[PDB]
């Protein structure tokens, strides 16, 4: 089972590696819950990501 | 009462090359092969024949052994698995050159002749048959992952890794998928040469193994697993 999360904020000045964006996403199943994730492609607010794992928390990737 | 195949004439199994990516295979990559040329006439550098010259280069003569790559090729190519057309070899030179060895090739048995072949290959970028019908040794473009089969398991021979039964390991593996073994032909060194491509590293025995023994030991695992005989 894979969860779906909608991006609510594209965090800035996170010091991430080139091409990686740190974003904050909100689970579609539970609107209250939010999780911080690392994304590889071009990303903006309101687009949905497929999270294979929902427990790991994003860490700065340098 | 299954009927026989219409023709029982023995047929040569296909020669398996990089163009074909679906067929099940055992690929052996002799990483960190020390293959370098240099003018004196050009000669493949050796740890014994050319010591002073390597010192001028500054390269350590411990890591100047192309004989290991020769020995592994002889045992890999002469193993029955190759005769059954289920093995293809690649060689990643230390410098960063990738060589594709056609399964059909017959490298000379004496080392002296082999060195003359590599200086030919590294400069001419290819070797052709005596009858001039196929290219036997062809230098190809990095990275290795592109030339590999599309669905493939990658493993490395690590002394520190857990010991496994090669026969058991291949049997539990899928059928459409193929197996690549990154063998380190280098005499001594950290087993991280293929850490970027590979996904796990496995050991073959509790005792240290030479590169020639290890690759040959992996082959006889595959032949029993696939009943190559």
């Amino acid at each position: 089972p894979v969860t779906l999360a909608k991006v609510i904020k594209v965090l800035g000045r996170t010091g991430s590696r080139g091409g990686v964006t740190q974003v904050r996403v909100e689970f579609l199943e539970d609107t209250s819950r939010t999780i911080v994730r690392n994304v590889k492609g071009p990303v903006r607010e309101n687009d949905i990501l497929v999270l294979m794992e929902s427990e790991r928390e994003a860490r700065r990737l340098r | 009462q299954k009927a026989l195949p219409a023709s029982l004439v023995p047929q040569a199994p296909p020669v398996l090359t990089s163009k074909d990516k679906i067929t099940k295979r055992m690929i052996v990559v002799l990483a960190m092969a020390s293959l370098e040329t240099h003018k004196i006439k050009y000669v493949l550098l050796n740890c014994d024949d050319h010591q002073g010259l390597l010192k001028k280069m500054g390269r350590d003569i411990s890591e100047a052994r192309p004989d290991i790559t020769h020995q592994c090729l002889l045992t890999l190519l002469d193993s029955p698995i190759n005769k059954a057309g289920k093995l293809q070899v690649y060689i990643q030179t230390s410098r960063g050159i990738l060589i594709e060895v056609n399964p059909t090739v017959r490298i000379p048995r004496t080392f002296k002749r082999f060195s003359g072949l590599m200086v030919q290959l590294l400069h001419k970028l290819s070797i052709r048959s005596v009858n001039s019908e196929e290219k036997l040794l062809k230098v190809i473009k990095n990275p290795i992952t592109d030339h590999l089969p599309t669905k493939c398991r990658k493993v490395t021979l690590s002394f520190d890794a857990p010991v496994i039964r090669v026969q058991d390991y291949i049997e539990k593996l899928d059928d459409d998928e193929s197996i690549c073994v990154f063998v380190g032909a280098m005499a001594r060194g950290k087993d991280n040469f293929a850490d970027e491509y590979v996904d796990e590293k496995v050991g073959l025995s509790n005792y240290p193994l030479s590169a020639s023994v290890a690759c040959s030991k992996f082959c006889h695992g595959a032949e029993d697993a696939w009943n190559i005989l």
């Binding site: 965090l11 000045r13 740190q22 609107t31 209250s32 999780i35 928390e57 | -």
Partner: protein, 63 residues
């Protein structure tokens, strides 16, 4: 921008930190404006998740 990067789990940690600072009246009045700016920003940014939580302990901390 530093506070926005913080996960919600650390926001509960931040709230506990502000709660513990309250008992120390010396520290509270030393940095009262700074505490307010960070506290109000934290609450505003992730208000939706904060209200959803049914933790009775958290309700008492905010009181």
């Amino acid at each position: 921008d530093a506070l926005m990067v913080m996960p919600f789990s650390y926001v509960l940690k931040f709230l506990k930190f502000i709660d513990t600072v309250m008992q120390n009246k010396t520290l509270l009045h030393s940095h009262l404006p700074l505490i307010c700016k960070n506290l109000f920003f934290i609450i505003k940014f992730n208000h939706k998740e904060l209200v959803s939580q049914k933790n009775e302990e958290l309700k008492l901390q905010i009181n």
